[PDB]
Amino acid sequence: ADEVQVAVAANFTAPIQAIAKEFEKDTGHRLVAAYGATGQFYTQIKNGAPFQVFLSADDSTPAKLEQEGEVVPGSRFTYAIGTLALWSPKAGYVDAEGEVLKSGSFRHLSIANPKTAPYGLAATQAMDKLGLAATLGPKLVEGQNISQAYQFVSSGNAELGFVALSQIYKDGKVATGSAWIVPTELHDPIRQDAVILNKGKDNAAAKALVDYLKGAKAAALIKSYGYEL
Ligand SMILES: [N+]
């Protein structure tokens, strides 16, 4: 039973580690994961990489690799859908329906740059749908990615941030601080897509992993880590 080398967006580290234990216990395939930012794997796969499967934190980068013939054509699918959360490390700062955001009664709001970060785009889409973009604009602090957006609500001076639910979840619930989980109607789906790389075209272990991700056991872990299927 061969191993499968997988490139995993760091957003998805904890779930793939849990999936890997079950995947190996149930199939004998050993899962060898590298973790990093989506763009780091994009540059590597373009330049030549050993992976047979790539789990992106977006859907545009797998699609670009397909357009470039660098991964198996037709292999792209959505393995997880991210969830956007309004979060503070302060207990009880964020009320259950997010009225703290909707009032505008706060000093700074941390977000990711929408041009490059899917969880940043979700935030700006939600603010636009609520009519809050212009009046909250002066309070925004923008980071390059969702990791920076989350860190700033902790080590920087923002009381609120639009973060990935997966950043604040443990064991199926928000682990610390306080959050408002943004309804799906307020933004486009935060699709996280996977592809099989040219190297994995005829690799049974690659196909087994990708289909395992589409199964019921994987779905249950994925939900508990803060995603939708
Ligand atoms: N929706």
Residue numbers in the entry: 23 to 251
Q: What sentences appear in the manuscript?
A:
Acquisition of the trace-element molybdenum via the high-affinity ATP-binding cassette permease ModABC is essential for Pseudomonas aeruginosa respiration in anaerobic and microaerophilic environments. Molybdenum, which predominantly occurs as the oxyanion molybdate (MoO42−; henceforth MoO), is imported via the high-affinity ATP-binding cassette (ABC) permease, ModABC in P. aeruginosa. Pseudomonas aeruginosa PAO1 ModA has a non-contiguous dual-hinged bilobal structure with a single metal-binding site positioned between the two domains.
Metal binding results in a 22° relative rotation of the two lobes with the oxyanions coordinated by four residues, that contribute six hydrogen bonds, distinct from ModA orthologues that feature an additional oxyanion-binding residue. Analysis of 485 Pseudomonas ModA sequences revealed conservation of the metal-binding residues and β-sheet structural elements, highlighting their contribution to protein structure and function.
